Homo-oligomer: 51 residues x 3
């Protein structure tokens, strides 16, 4: 199944190996996303002044 | 210490092996949840009119 | 590349091994605050009563 020879074969495909080797970093960025949404709560007070 | 023989042993347990090769896809679905929240912003303008 | 000898080498570094073998559980916990954020939409009705 999983061996030195099995893993080294995906380096020739290049494109898929990059995606399966950067997903870990990607989840941390999707964490900061929810925190960004909270400021909209202040925009609701600005929405009451809208003509 | 992760070997060809150690990995192939979990295929006899069947049920728990699924948890080690499907959760990666499941994180992207928790990525659609945050996108859904924005419509709540327009609902706040419908909530003050609620007779 | 990934081998029995390559994995057993990070046990001498100790600190990095813990970071690469506990975050997987943490993604479920970073999935708890998203459900919590909704009450801020409810706080907008309490903000209209706040003199």
């Amino acid at each position: 199944l999983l061996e030195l020879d099995k893993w080294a074969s995906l380096w020739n495909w290049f494109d898929i190996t990059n995606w399966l080797w950067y997903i870990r970093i990607f989840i941390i960025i999707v964490g900061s996303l929810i925190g960004l949404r909270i400021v909209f709560a202040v925009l609701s007070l600005v929405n009451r002044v809208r003509q």
